[PDB]
Amino acid sequence: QRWELALGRFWDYLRWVQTLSEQVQEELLSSQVTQELRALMDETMKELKAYKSELEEQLTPVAEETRARLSKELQAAQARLGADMEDVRGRLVQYRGEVQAMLGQSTEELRVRLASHLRKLRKRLLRDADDLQKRLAVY
């Protein structure tokens, strides 16, 4: 669970950014949440790498070159998750700039759009974390 507990925190913070409260919106226009999100993503990847590395002592490789198949699949499940986390971080970096371009105008429509976009990106990150939990469990 260390990587899972590290991801649970990436995920809880994002659930909070998704509400777009006054505080989210404040911190959204500085680098504060994209930077805090970057730290949590890094820690999830850090912990994930270290976990697969220590799981690779336990294994029974009795169907030979299938462990290769298995590992290169698990290494892409991993790359999926990191990309996902980075897509979110980047929709958020786009937001800050779309607001700067409005020039004081009402950002209420950008916020309605941001939200349904983030809802999708989080649905994606959640099925890819699930799939990554599956592969890591055939280990």
Task: Please give a structural write-up.
The chain has 139 residues and is mainly alpha-helical. It is built from five helices and no strands. The longest helix has 37 residues. The two termini are 14 Å apart.
In short:
The chain is mainly α and about 140 residues long. About 85% of the residues lie in helices and about 0% in strands.
In the CATH classification, which architecture applies?
Up-down Bundle
Helix content: over 70%
CATH superfamily: Apolipoprotein
Number of helices: 5
Radius of gyration: 18 Å
CATH class: Mainly Alpha
Main sheet attributes: strand count, strand direction, barrel closure:
none
Q: Structural class, judged by helices and strands?
A: mainly alpha
CATH level 3 topology: Four Helix Bundle (Hemerythrin (Met), subunit A)
Count of strand segments = 0
Distance between the termini: 14 Å
> What's the SSE pattern?
HHHHH
How many domains in all?
1
Strand-residue fraction? Answer: under 5%
| Principal-axes shape call | elongated
Sequence repeats: 39-60, 61-82, 83-104, 105-126
Subcellular location: Secreted; Secreted, Extracellular space; Secreted, Extracellular space, Extracellular matrix; Extracellular vesicle
Organism: Homo sapiens
Family: Belongs to the apolipoprotein A1/A4/E family.
